[PDB]
Amino acid sequence: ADVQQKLAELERQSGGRLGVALINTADNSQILYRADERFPMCSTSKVMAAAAVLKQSETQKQLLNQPVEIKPADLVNYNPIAEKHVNGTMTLAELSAAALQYSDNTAMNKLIAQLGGPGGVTAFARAIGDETFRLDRTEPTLNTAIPGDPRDTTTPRAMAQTLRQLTLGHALGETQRAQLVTWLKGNTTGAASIRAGLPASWVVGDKTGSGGYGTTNDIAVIWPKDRAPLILVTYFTQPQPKAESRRDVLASAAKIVTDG
Amino acid sequence: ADVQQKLAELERQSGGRLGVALINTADNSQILYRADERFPMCSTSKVMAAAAVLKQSETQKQLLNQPVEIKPADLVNYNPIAEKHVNGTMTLAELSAAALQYSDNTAMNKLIAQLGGPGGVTAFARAIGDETFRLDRTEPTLNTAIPGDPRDTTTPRAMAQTLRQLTLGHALGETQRAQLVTWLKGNTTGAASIRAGLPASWVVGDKTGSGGYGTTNDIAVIWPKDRAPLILVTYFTQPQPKAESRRDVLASAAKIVTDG
């Protein structure tokens, strides 16, 4: 498929390493590029954690309304929502939204804590059939993104398959699946990434990721004009530790794979 | 200045006409580039409409809870939220959010009708001291953005002053100002525009706009790390009817005026 040549071209131009997995739910067809290679997830991992919390709330029916304490010492490097609530509290719902829609790192650490550490986020992945995801660290160190380090990684194929089960399948209860999709469709950080390569009429929920080595990621559920939904993972990392983000590469990958 | 020269260099290479107004509320200093020329607002006008409804909600305190009918005939050209609710209803709060955060055109038309037509939006503008803003048409024809047409235009200076008064000033009651800022901070469509030219740590609320003649707009309230807020308006329009959007130009603008 010319799609392979275009993604290769894109990758070469960019100077980095590009991973892509597209699932077309119209017929289960896939478009795959380095789809079995590991990449640092950075903030795209917030989807597994918010989902895991949603799964716990299937049993603990009030859990999303539980207030959680935010102390000044809980603040980390990017706390756009949580900083408003220091010496106060946010609900687990508020925290899940802040993590997903604002990429709030404080909010992610609270989700992590609620699940019993990075291992509880990994346990949830395993419960829904994802044998590849691993979360190893909290924010912000889960973003180091060191070339060859397996920590805090997954593969595009695995993340796409998981995002399909979570947003379109039966990994979560119907209310919880709906809540996840609502959160993702309200993301504030995504217009420069996958969405930017798609026709304006298409509806999208996504989570972006950013970290070291110019790691620039996005995972998305997509409801095109006139077509069954798609899942798309676009992962991108660079050779230089202080490399600049490249959201435009993800936009470009999305354009390439949804023409074909 | 250096900034002026840089903005001229950006405009000369952009293939269009660029309008910028930056107000720095630390000291009321300004950066102005074609800031008294008119441009088509497109969906940036949705701030005025939402605000005018928020003002109405100061005296009809249930107003935002009021259900409004969405009929198939109401659907226009970009209805990401309203299409889900056809033969159903949306509240005015939902309509205000859908217009501001998703740029839903059906939702804007409901705001307009709740305000008595385009005239009514303009009358609100006049009421808070904006003599420049004019809303003439409903969606989607308000976006035709024909050069020389004064319908549905304003100037960068007037829009920056108005956004300041609405988000940081006393045009709205405190509850209502806070609601507006919250909705703007939750915008889904802004990551490739002004936000893309600012440091990540800075908090932004914005409203983008797109229309005919490649018109690509963004207005923003910005809370820089360590500094009093800024108000930024970046307006751009091109000479060909079918020109493509240029969000990149707005990000470049934002970087030039906030570097200096």
UniProtKB/TrEMBL annotation, chains A, B:
Its EC number is 3.5.2.6. Keywords: Antibiotic resistance, Hydrolase, Plasmid, Signal. One of its GO terms (molecular function) is beta-lactamase activity. InterPro entries: Beta-lactam/transpept-like, Beta-lactam_cat, Beta-lactam_class-A, Beta-lactam_class-A_AS, Cefotaximase. Residues 20-234 form the Beta-lactamase class A catalytic domain. Pfam families: Beta-lactamase2. Belongs to the class-A beta-lactamase family. This is Beta-lactamase.
